[PDB]
Every structure is written in structure tokens, then in C-alpha cells.
Amino acid sequence: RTIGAELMELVRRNTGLSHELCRVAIGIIVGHIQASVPASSPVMEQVLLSLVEALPSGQVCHDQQRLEVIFADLARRKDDAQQRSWALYEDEGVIRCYLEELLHILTDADPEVCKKMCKRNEFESVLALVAYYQMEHRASLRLLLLKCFGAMCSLDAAIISTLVSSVLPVELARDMQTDTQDHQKLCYSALILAMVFSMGEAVPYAHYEHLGTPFAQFLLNIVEDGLPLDTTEQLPDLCVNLLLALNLHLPAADQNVIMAALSKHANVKIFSEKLLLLLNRGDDPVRIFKHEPQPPHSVLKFLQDVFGSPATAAIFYHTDMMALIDITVRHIADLSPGDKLRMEYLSLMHAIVRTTPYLQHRHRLPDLQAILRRILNEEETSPQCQMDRMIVREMCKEFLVLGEAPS
Amino acid sequence: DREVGIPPEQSLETAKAVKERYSYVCPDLVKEFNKYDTDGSKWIKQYTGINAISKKEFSIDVGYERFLGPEIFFHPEFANPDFTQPISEVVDEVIQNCPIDVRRPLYKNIVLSGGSTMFRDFGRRLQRDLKRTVDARLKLSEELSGGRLKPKPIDVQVITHHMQRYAVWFGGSMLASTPEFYQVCHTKKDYEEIGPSICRHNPVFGV
Amino acid sequence: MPAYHSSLMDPDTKLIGNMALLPIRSQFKGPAPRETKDTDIVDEAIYYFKANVFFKNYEIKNEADRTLIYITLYISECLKKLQKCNSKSQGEKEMYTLGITNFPIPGEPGFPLNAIYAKPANKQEDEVMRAYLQQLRQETGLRLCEKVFDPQNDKPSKWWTCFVKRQFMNKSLS
Secondary structure, three states, rough: OOOOHHHHHHHHHOOOOOHHHHHHHHHHHHHHHHHHHHHHHHHHHHHHHHHHHOOOOOOHHHHHHHHHHHHHHHHHHHOOHHHHHHOOOOHHHHHHHHOOOHHHHHHHHHHHHHHHHOOOOOOOOOOHHHHHHHHOOHHHHHHHHHHHHHHOOOOOOOHHHHHHOOOOHHHHHHHHHHHOHHHHHHHHHEEEEEEEOOOOOOOOHHHOOOOHHHHHHHHHHHHHHHOOOOOOOOOOHHHHHHHHHHOOOOOOHOOOHHHHHHHHHHOOOOOOOOOHHHHHHEEEEEEEOOOOOOOOOOHHHHHHHHHOHHHHOOOOHHHHHHHHHHHHHHHHOOOOOOOOOOOHHHHHEEEEHHHOHHHHHHHHHHHHHHHHHHHHHOOOHHHHHHHHHHHHHHHHHHHHOOOOOOO | OOOOOHHHHHHHHHHHHHHHHOOOOOHHHHHHHHHHHHHHHOEEEEEEOOOOOOEOOOOOOOOOHHHHOOOHHOOOOOOOOOOOOOOHHHHHHHOOOOOHHHHHHOOOOEEOOOOOOOOOHHHHHHHHHHHHHHHHHHHHHHHOOOOOOOOOOOOOOOOOOOOOHHHHHHHHHHOOOOOHHHHHOOHHHHHHHHHHHHHHOOOOOOO | OOOOOOOOOOOOEEOOEEEEEEOOOOOOOOOOOOOOOOOOOHHHHHHHHHHHOOOOOOOOOOHHHHHHHHHHHHHHHHHHHHHHOOHHHHHHHHHHHHHHHOOOOOOOOOOOOOOOOOOOOOOOHHHHHHHHHHHHHHHHHHHHHHHHHEEEOEEEEEHHHHOOOOOOOOOOOO
């Protein structure tokens, strides 16, 4: 009745395997004794169904016990005011052992266990580590906490709302501007910051003291000039994915803190080069997790906001804008009706004509004119397809030369 | 919670500095929160520190932690939930548990010592929380008796003497400079005979 | 010493459940009688909020304390939503939407103080409670927005959003 769940607990204990491979090992063993010994097939098929399709009453998982023991000590070591500010005993080897064990459980065990024990009592255990991180100064332990937060964001999205609304993104954004020597901590800090901002949820206003415009200039100076200690050159492609994610919850490009960074910078070229290599493929590097509701496309959200003002539009060199128009045009046509993105490329194109002198050089204007007349003459009746046509009319109405026949 | 921007290595250095310089003791707690809200320019100070890595300055606004730190002498459940009694009440139980003849002279000489009594207006509040507590007890007895005698009031006095950072040391130097010290001192000989239990007892307990 | 309790209780004050259906100065509509004085159970709980969240022991002397404890728990729900707001007009719109939300009540799960609160026995008393609280949940939020937001920038103050992590004792209406 409950065999398939009581075996997985036995196997994970005495082998250390993950949840997935625990089910594989049993499905293979059973599925092979069933075939070699047909006399046992009725018993085996019940056993397989228990896997495909709960635990006994008092029996509690091993991974659930450990998370009661780990979250309880780390919160006890947080509430130990003496040992934190006035150290006497050694703590780096014990804490490093509980945080390693935690990272192997969140990474391998069943997510629904690791979800409830983190969602328990209104995220009491998550929010402690977020404070212990603020309290701890040792980078050997700040690094393991980041690897643990990155595993908790993959489980649920309610945890992301808990972290982004907390003080974590303000300490990372403060440790990165200050402690630039540690390369791993600077590269993981920029990963977690992109995780928690991935969903587009808003944040307290107080975060913008350390996540505002001076933090963007710091990230642009790294994207453009790089660091000396960055030998492998991972950090520019992480400080790009982070800027794309900060700009997700930020509305009203005129009021945007990031765009004030671009318009203040002397010359951005490497940040613009990288935005187009992402647009050519239509890949959202911020979208690491498969959590609903799926937020918008981070790149187009950015470029829609770049071209929401003419001060930020002039960052693109001449050769790059023409490559941006060749791409946007190619996607508008290659995309099918009923897609969500087609109005984004259209709204993006509408933003280019306003804030740039597109009507003086008119690059790919004939190929564009033929595509908009098609989209208006499309007889589709979905609501989304009516939103596209609604944009095109506004685009042609504002600029008439986009409605004329190609010539 | 409020002032992020303090490095974790310099939170302790920053808290002592606020405590030693800006903090003080308030007559009433909730009335101070209003003074910090209604008139913030007058009560909120500023503390510029120095980072030790980048050598760049960091600044903060010093607010409710000016009176909230010292308040735990009088509301110690702010920090330790295992204790609720103020120090103004601990002193009254210490004295009312002492013999009836030496209760008045003990209220009249309350000596604040130690570095954590250097807070501004510490004795002024302790001397006030007691005189409330002492003038009422005498009032109640005057009522139960019949109101025929108005008992003499008690002269509470909380003095804060000039030497605090080395008060205890000074009483040890005056002592050691006597000859009486060299009699009560346990001795190497007495240790070899009786053993390390020669120093087992203290005045806090008997036998 | 003890925390700050409610001084407004009077034997002429009505009781709902084991709470104190006390007068409130509001344009909102509910079973609460309208007050004439310049102080209410709301203005008190907002006066005593910043101080009462540091204490760790609260002794329930009367039923008005059960009304103060509720507001002091709901003010910690306002500030979670208000710290994300960039303008007072955006806060008043968020404070409306929250009061309409049907939080738990005395008797049902979610409420952290089911033991020391008395549920409504009859259904009529239930309907009065859910409309008395909703009258507090609306005037509380409307009155915070006058205080939280610094008029110099029209954005939340760090002197109020520092109490976001300070629950009343550790309880919450959620």
C-alpha cells in the first residue's frame, strides 16, 4: 500500500542517492525481476504503481529531520549574541558542515519537503540565514549561504518574494561595491541578485540606496572595462543579466534609475554589443527558473525603456542600430500570429522611430512597410492579434510614411 | 535593520561609538518617539565612519538607538526575555530585604559605578523611580494606621562619582597598600596544606 | 515595567465577543459608533506602536486591550505593503485593497490568538465582527499614510519601515 515510498526513504539513507535516482534504481530492479521471474509479476506491478502514483503515520523522512536540526542550530547560532560579536569558540568548521549538508539536501531531496520546511511559520528559517548573512563577515561561509539561497529560489517563487523584499539584495549590492577582491563571491552575488529579481516583483524603496544608479554604474564599468582579477571573464555576462533583471520591475523609463546610468556614462559599447547577441536569438538569460506567472522578456523590456527617451537612444553606434533594425524586422515577420512577443518587437520598433532619426536614413523601411500592411490585412480574430493591429494603426497614424506602399 | 551601509566588520565599532557619544536616558519612552518624529532635525544626529578596506567614509543617521539602548536597564525584556524587573525595582527589593534599621542609610547612599552607568540622566531617573516607590509605601502605611502620624520622608540620593573606569582598581590599590592586606591574603604555604579549596568561599553564601 | 495599555475602556462601552466595540472617528461605514474626542483606539495604537513592538510580555487587563493588539498586528501588515510604495496616493490605494481582504477572525485558523479571544457564538455577532474589524483595517491604513510618507520626497520614511521586521510579540495576521 505504501511500499514505493518506504523504499525510497530506505535507499536515500543507505546510499545517499538523489530523489530522481532513488526512483530509477527501484524501477529498474523491480522491472527486471518482473521480466526475468514472471511468477512475481503481480507483486511487482503493485510496487511500481506505488511509485508512479505519503509515508506511514509516525515515520518522518530523514531529510526532513536534518532540516529541523540544521535550521534550528543556525538560528541558535544567530541568536547567540556573544559568540557573533565577541568570539570565543570555533564555529567555522561546524557551520561549514551544516551548510554543506543543507546544500546537498536542497539540491537532491524531494522539493516538496524542502519547500514546506522553508515555507514553515512564514519563512522563519529562510529569513534567519538572511540575517546571519548580514551578521557574518567570513567569505568562506557567505559563499555557501549563496549556494543555498540559489537552491531555495529554484523550489518556489514565494521564496523569491521573501528574499528580494528582505535585506539580502542590499548587503550583496554593498559587498560587491566594497569587496571586489574576492572573485567567487562577486560572481555568485551577481547570480543570486539576478535570481531574486527574475520575477519582476517590486521592492521596498529603501533598496534603491544600494541598488539604484550608483550600483548600475558599478556594473557598467565592469561590463565595459572589466576587472583585473577576472581571468575567466564570466562577470560581464553576469553583470549584464543582472541589469536586465533590475529593469524588470522598474516602470516609466523617464523615472528609471538604470537609464540615468547609461545617460551619465561616457561611452557604452560592450553593453550594447551584448544586448544584440541576445536579441538575435531571442533568449532570456534572466529566465533561469520555470515558475509561473512568467514575467516579461527582460531584453525587450530593457530596449523598450532605452528608446523611451532620446538621451538613452544615442548610446548605440550607427552600425549597431542598423543591426538592431535588421533583427527586429526579421522577428516581426518570422513570428506567427497569436504570439505574445510580436507586439513587443512592434512596440520596440515604434519606440525607435520616435527617439531616433529613422526617417532620415530609412533603413529597411520598404521591407517594414510590407510587413505592417500584411499585419493589418490579417483576418485573425484572437485578442492578441487585435492588439498587434491596434499598435500598427497607431504606428502608421503617428508616422504616415510607414503606411505608404513599398517603393 | 535601518542603516545598511555599515560593514559587518565595523558594526560593533559603530555601536560603541554611538553608545558612548550620542546615547542618553529618557524620562518616558513613547514621548521620545514623537520628539524624533515631530521634530527630527533636533534629535537625529549623524555619524561619519571610515571603512577599513577602501578607506572611504560611510555616514548614517542616529535616531531611536540613542535612548533605546539604555532603556533596557528599565525595560530589560527588550534584550533578554528572561528578565522583566527594572533596576529601579531591583534596588527596592535589595533594600527592603535588608534589616529595618539600615534601610534609610542605604537609600541615602546609592553609588553608581562602572562604565555602563556613565549614561546621561541615569541617576536622575533611578532616583525618581524610587522616590515614587518609597513615598507611596509610606503613604499606604499612614493610611492603614489611621492617619495620626505623618512619617518622615526618605532621602533618596544617587551619586555618580568621578572615577568609574578605574573605581574597582582604586579600591584594590588602597587596600593592597595597607598591612591588613598581607594578613587576609591566602598564602603559598596555606595552599600546599589545605589545597585550592582555600579560595572556595565568598560572602554571597554561608557555611 | 509594563507595556502601554488602553485607557479608553469604560463600562458603558459595548462588547463584541470578548473585545471592546469602541468608538472610531472615520468616514467609513460599520458598526462602530462615531467618536467626538480627538483620541481613539486607533490614534493610541499608532502612538504606542513603536514602543510596544519591543516588549515581550503583554498582560490582558481588559477587552480594549484585545482591540489594541489587533490593530498593532495589522499595522505591521500595512508597512509591508507601504515600503514598496513610491507615492502616498499609491499607498491609500493599497490600504483600501487590504482592508477589503477577509483576514481571519476570532475562532478560525490563521488568527494567532484563538485561545485568548472569544469567537462569535451566533451568526449575527459574526457579521458584526467582520464589519467592525474592516472599519479598523481601513481607518488605520488611511491614517498611517499621513505619517509614513515624508512630504519632502513623498516617499516612505526609514523611521517607520525599520519596524517591518518587528512583529508585535512575534504574531501576525497571516
